[PDB]
Design an enzyme around this catalytic site. Structure first.
Site, PDB file in Angstrom:
ATOM      1  N   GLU A 134      -2.434 -12.363  -5.991  1.00 47.42           N
ATOM      2  CA  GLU A 134      -1.786 -11.355  -5.158  1.00 47.42           C
ATOM      3  C   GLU A 134      -1.480 -11.890  -3.761  1.00 47.42           C
ATOM      4  OE1 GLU A 134      -0.421  -8.743  -6.107  1.00 47.42           O
ATOM      5  OE2 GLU A 134      -1.503  -8.020  -7.883  1.00 47.42           O
ATOM      6  N   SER A 164       8.629   0.568  -0.814  1.00 45.70           N
ATOM      7  CA  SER A 164       7.207   0.505  -0.493  1.00 45.70           C
ATOM      8  C   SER A 164       6.834  -0.937  -0.129  1.00 45.70           C
ATOM      9  CB  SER A 164       6.341   1.005  -1.660  1.00 45.70           C
ATOM     10  OG  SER A 164       6.421   0.129  -2.769  1.00 45.70           O
ATOM     11  N   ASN A 186      -0.515  -0.977  -2.522  1.00 52.09           N
ATOM     12  CA  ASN A 186       0.845  -0.486  -2.333  1.00 52.09           C
ATOM     13  C   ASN A 186       0.954   0.867  -1.616  1.00 52.09           C
ATOM     14  OD1 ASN A 186       3.234   1.174  -3.824  1.00 52.09           O
ATOM     15  ND2 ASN A 186       3.816  -0.921  -3.376  1.00 52.09           N
ATOM     16  N   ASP A 197       3.363  -3.824  -0.167  1.00 53.20           N
ATOM     17  CA  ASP A 197       2.013  -4.206  -0.585  1.00 53.20           C
ATOM     18  C   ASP A 197       1.293  -4.924   0.549  1.00 53.20           C
ATOM     19  OD1 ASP A 197       2.795  -3.397  -3.226  1.00 53.20           O
ATOM     20  OD2 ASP A 197       3.732  -5.372  -3.437  1.00 53.20           O
ATOM     21  N   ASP A 243      11.538  -0.654  -4.303  1.00 52.85           N
ATOM     22  CA  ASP A 243      11.583   0.787  -4.060  1.00 52.85           C
ATOM     23  C   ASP A 243      11.402   1.148  -2.583  1.00 52.85           C
ATOM     24  OD1 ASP A 243       8.843   0.471  -3.677  1.00 52.85           O
ATOM     25  OD2 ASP A 243       8.268   2.151  -4.953  1.00 52.85           O
ATOM     26  N   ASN A 286       8.599  -4.149  -1.618  1.00 49.34           N
ATOM     27  CA  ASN A 286       9.023  -3.869  -2.988  1.00 49.34           C
ATOM     28  C   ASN A 286      10.427  -3.309  -3.023  1.00 49.34           C
ATOM     29  OD1 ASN A 286       5.759  -2.644  -3.238  1.00 49.34           O
ATOM     30  ND2 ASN A 286       6.451  -4.554  -4.168  1.00 49.34           N
TER      31      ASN A 286
END
Ligand SMILES: [Cl-]
Ligand SMILES: [Cl-]
Ligand SMILES: [Cl-]
EC number: 3.2.1.17
Length: 129
Positions: free
Chosen positions: A35, A50, A59, A52, A48, A46
């Site tokens: 990650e 959002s 998220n 992380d 969309d 991301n």
């Protein structure tokens, strides 16, 4: 902060993540490796909209507030910035909620794709724990 492998394993154990919801410490270290490469300051945007955050790339759609993810929730009740601290407490406490949400560690797609079913014990091998 960029953790060493064993250093992170120890910190995760200190915070009660070892075998949490049945997931051995190597699972958590493996997830963090892929990650964030063990970097608490890791962020990724991301598709969309959002973002992380942190060592476990938690998220903003569900788990933390960043003020710029429309329609999102903040189920860990924290600013997303808290997930970037050198102190992993907020990331660990939030991860405990995430992994308890129903799908276990499959919530981390990178864990599913790169850690699940592998020799995850390798991630803590040699570590004084
Ligand atoms: Cl393990
Ligand atoms: Cl928001
Ligand atoms: Cl992946």
């Amino acid at each position: 902060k960029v953790f060493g492998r064993c250093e992170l394993a120890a910190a995760m154990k200190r915070h009660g993540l070892d075998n949490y919801r049945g997931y051995s410490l190597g699972n958590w270290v493996c997830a963090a490796k892929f990650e964030s490469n063990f970097n608490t300051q890791a962020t990724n945007r991301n598709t969309d909209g959002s973002t992380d955050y942190g060592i476990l790339q938690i998220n903003s759609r569900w788990w933390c507030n960043d003020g710029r993810t429309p329609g999102s929730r903040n189920l860990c009740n924290i600013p997303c910035s808290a997930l970037l601290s050198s102190d992993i407490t907020a990331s660990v406490n939030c991860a405990k909620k995430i992994v308890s949400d129903g799908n276990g560690m499959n919530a981390w797609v990178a864990w599913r794709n790169r850690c699940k079913g592998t020799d995850v014990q390798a991630w803590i091998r040699g570590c004084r724990l």
